[PDB]
């Protein structure tokens, strides 16, 4: 029953970058008008926005009300932002569904959104530290790349898995290339054109517009790539190069139902058969998208082979592998325009960021059948299958 | 279709007061493995664990996780948190329903926590701060109190909804003698010790048992009550112990479907029947559970005669009267064993936490169709409405 | 040739004590009044204030001034101050003596102030930490209390000692119990009224006069004293019940010459014959007063047993029976009246707090020569002979 | 009887400029280093240091000492800072020429040492912050710019002299311009190369070696600075132009007596006649320079118009035109190589940055009497004569 009606993204920035200074929900707003005027449906009749989002520290009153209530949505729609790490941005889009199709809501608003830049060092000074030193924690590092479980970064978690399937540093480095030069490729050629809005950095030297990802390389050889030192475990593997950095953007959808889609000329972007979710062990927690995505499968209906487009995400390239390996798909057709390690994250948004990849590339090439998959920290993952109408 | 085979909150603290130093997610775990025993359920079969939560700052990957393993749920169940203010806690419910409800999950558990106390303080030090002072913000108020969309705390929006319906300082006075009376007086009778779940808050020079709501004042007076000048408007009439205050708590119930609670001879306390959430005039954001309250009512098929017990959000002397003046239901049913003003508030459970109360009075005196409702930050209801069998 | 005419210090505060909120030129101004009231020359004859303090983070420009301004002195006459840690309240009287002897001024103000309570805590933010985390420093601590060139607190440095002179755990306690017993007495017998001057601690619920030192234990056992694990070395020997406190205070004295005095007629509290300063190995910290005194006494032409009554800074029972030992005066005349141990130890105004106490010491009892010595971190020590009139 | 055998300044640094992260004391040792070995005296023969400073919160136990010690002065000669503002750098020449006087010292070295950009931000926290926003006081504005009295700026008591000496907003601007061109000037034709020591900033892609300063603007246009909008007070007379900036560096001389120069055969940079200090109205503060000037003029026998040679620190454009019309010495002899608008300032070391300007001046156009004098905030005012060999 339930249709994507329309689909955006901003241009995803670098850390500390053109939207250094950009509040997350003011990303969230500029999409969420994109959605409404290219499905030419009214924010007036918007029921709900849902945002994930992972890093909100100091951002004021639930920036879902106020990204949508900007973007004119009115009083009378609801907002809510949540929260699964990287699984947020495509969860989103998944509970949004789950609202037209329990009868509880006719259209919505979906995605996620994230300033890693405007993550603020936080202290719990409450009580008042008498006497000595304290830390001021990084929220960013803190909430959002720490596992709660162990005490390390999420490249460890990596290395757990590299060293399980044994990926060595030839082959993570040569997958990073890969991703480099097949998002570079595809900048170039206008194939993130469709998706892209344009942002407007409202300044004072002057206003300036964003409509590129700043994130990818140009030329990055396997070289520059392989005189690296691992980022996390000295003699293990993961480094910047393979690795995704820092960054900050948005992503949405507008919901509906294929009846109502019909009724208004709207020809939708696709129609979600199936979404699953599942959870793993912390330690290796890259393998959430293996169990995820065949949980999908079953409840699509689909064989792994009918997948025509797969956009996984490449939070770091030993987990991207181990879900590629793993899983067999045709690997040429996963990340088709590049993946993560090239466009970066912002978490909150990596999920409805790469539906939008998919999206897109599914309507430009006819392909009928795909499927969106992340991996999670704490050890989970997310699937969604998506058919073209 | 969908039932609460069980629930359980822990006792509410004081801010800074039993849980001073207390992570939510660790009185998260202790709400989850109680609803589990209570009513028999085992940690495996969960499949996922959905919590609000609007203060997460500085706590960690994914709270809702973190308090879900602590509890003893296994490493696959899935665990998020989500944010809609004081509703938060109600309408994680609703969104756990409704995984039941599609064909994603057997058995969710839904609540909210929250620890006003941890609650750190923050400022954006990224791009540095060149030159002047700056200031350090209290997440608790910048993220829980400060609509971000005028300029003013809460308190002076129940200022803006008693404005038009006049609510003298008398009646504002009136409505919290009557709340703290009617909930110390339950208290007393025994009434919260089936509801709360003994918490364990381990100190060094031993450890201490909190199960008795310590924010419960006693012989609530009308004479110490009337000289307490007004908090929010300096020419206003909201005062502190008539505005809701800061407080520690979380408190969840378990969900399955009615067939499943019966194939597992588990008593239920009651059917969810309805649910809803509506938008009203930011400005008085109070007045959510009058709309919301007859879309729940509707889309029950009741009308408010049916209803034989009732829980209204008493975020204010301010916006708890005009809801009841508004909607027009009879008092003598509604937070009968006491409300926020006398309970105390805690921002991300405190849905939840009403939720129990009416279930656990429900059994014990024989109402059949309960409801809860609460106003939300920004203009928002949520309502639902409860069947017990 | 130039000569003490009057003294005063307030009483010694603990750490968040008496003087939590209040600020160091506070306390120095009442100090400046007194020296200027109890010798009978008016605050417009002052030509130059001369303030040791240590830590002036958050005060303002020159607190040296602000005193000398609260004080009444003409914004005609100068004011500045000097840190050299622990001696600076008596190196500034040095300094002051300078002023006079080379015909630069006539009649200084000299002493020391400091209020350990009113550190702040703080963070280098302009570049700004792009990630990761940052401490937020106790000034106190960082500026105050330890050495940055082996690296180890100021209590180490004692530990050294310890294991160097062979100083038993139970020899140390024994000193510090004496120390206690002294001033204890010394208070009771009403030895310190004449040395101290009141303070009004300004009350937004009343003033509240302090009056006496308020770090001094009554009673303390030795039992309580040889329970206490060692503070800084875990495996060693000092401990917090042997080492001075942390403690706020100001203190001292008006300079002129000797004749100039006789013009007026002021009964002098005695003749600066000399003083000196030297340097010693800074991870012995406490030995300065070795070479101090012999310095100042050979200048003074004095032979060690010509000494009447002596003040030595007990730093830390460590270094005070060090010195003691090694330089070999009867202890029968040294901390006559309890010690740093007992007393306090506001760092910028203990130089000048043992010389008031001295003084007045000396004439209570009628004694010819004096000497006062403290212990530096960054190994120094300073010491000046006194000889009454 | 007293001279300076040699001195040397650090280039002075941009605001986090050049040398953005060097701790002050580094930038101390070394000019230490630098005066020791232009006068063919061993560090080991240094009796004291003796270093003026304003803003030393962070840098551990006294910065001065440290200063000495990476100079390798030896660990028997002693150490310590001071505090009278703008005027540290010089009044700690004319106390280092006190010691030497008095017969307490054979050779001192003196001077001062500023940081601005290592200044830290702060707040007191001791207390207990129960909830509520902060501040984060920025030491260099609190402690080294702000008038403790009226709460004020350093900017705005240049305001004062503006309306009290009629300087109108074009009159002030020109002579700022006028500096600016002479201090071009006297760079390009190297007459910076004498004083300047160069220090290498230690960096980790490569060390980066620091010889001029680099505050100091070319082609300085008229227009540039009248186009420049009040800064201090919106429509007030003073800017970011005509007024000193913020600077980092260090500047000392080494002190002994003139006979033992005699002996060692070293041909001395000059003699000093004498000095003086004093206090003018708190709020024409930049006022200061007149009295002292004169008291010092006096105190050497000297007529202002015997001075072959005048040094006067610019503070502000306000100030330099009052302290130049009311002293009546003819302007061409001042500044000669520009001054400190241009040169910029960097509190504590400021007052020895233009002693090590006069010597080097004196000596290169033979001058035989020179002079240097600087306004104090807080209303004070410092100045020394010197004369030469």
Chains 1, 2, 3, 4 share one sequence.
């Not at 030839?170 to 344009?198: C, L, M, T, Y």
Request: charged letters at 20%.
């Amino acid at each position: 029953s339930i249709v994507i009606a329309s689909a955006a993204r901003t241009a995803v920035g670098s850390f500390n970058g053109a939207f250094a200074n950009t509040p997350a929900h003011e990303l969230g707003a500029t999409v969420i008008s994109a959605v409404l005027e290219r499905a030419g449906v009214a924010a007036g009749e918007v029921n709900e926005v849902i945002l994930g989002q992972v890093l909100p520290a100091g951002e004021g009153q639930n920036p879902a009300r106020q990204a949508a209530m900007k973007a004119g949505v009115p009083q009378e729609a609801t907002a809510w932002g949540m929260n699964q790490l990287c699984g947020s941005g495509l969860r989103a889009v998944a509970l949004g569904m789950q609202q037209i199709a329990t009868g509880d809501a006719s259209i919505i608003v979906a995605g996620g959104m994230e300033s890693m830049s405007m993550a603020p060092h936080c202290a719990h000074l409450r009580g008042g530290v008498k006497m000595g030193d304290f830390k001021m924690i990084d929220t960013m590092i803190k909430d959002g790349l720490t596992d709660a479980f162990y005490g390390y970064h999420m490249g460890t978690t990596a290395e757990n898995v590299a060293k399980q399937w044994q990926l060595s540093r030839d082959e993570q480095d040569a997958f990073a290339v890969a991703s480099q030069n097949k998002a570079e490729a595809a900048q170039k050629d206008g194939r993130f054109k469709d998706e892209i809005v344009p942002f407007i950095v409202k300044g004072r030297k002057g206003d300036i517009t964003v409509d590129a990802d700043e994130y990818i390389r140009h030329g990055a050889t396997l070289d520059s790539m392989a005189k690296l030192r691992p980022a996390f475990d000295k003699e293990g593997t993961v480094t910047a190069g393979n690795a995704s950095g820092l960054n900050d953007g948005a992503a949405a959808a507008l919901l509906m139902s294929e009846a109502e889609a019909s009724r208004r000329g709207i020809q939708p972007l696709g129609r979600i058969v199936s979404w699953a979710t599942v959870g793993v062990d912390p330690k290796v927690m890259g393998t959430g998208p293996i169990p995820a995505s065949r949980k999908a499968l079953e409840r699509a209906g689909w064989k792994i082979g009918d997948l025509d487009l797969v956009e996984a995400h490449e939070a770091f390239a030993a987990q991207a592998c181990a879900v590629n390996k793993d899983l067999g798909w045709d690997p040429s057709i996963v990340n088709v325009n590049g993946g993560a390690i090239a466009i970066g994250n912002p978490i909150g948004a990596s999920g409805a960021r790469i539906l939008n990849t998919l999206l897109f590339e599914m309507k430009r090439r006819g392909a009928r059948k795909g499927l969106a998959t992340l991996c999670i920290g704490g050890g989970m993952g997310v699937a969604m299958c998506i058919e073209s109408l």
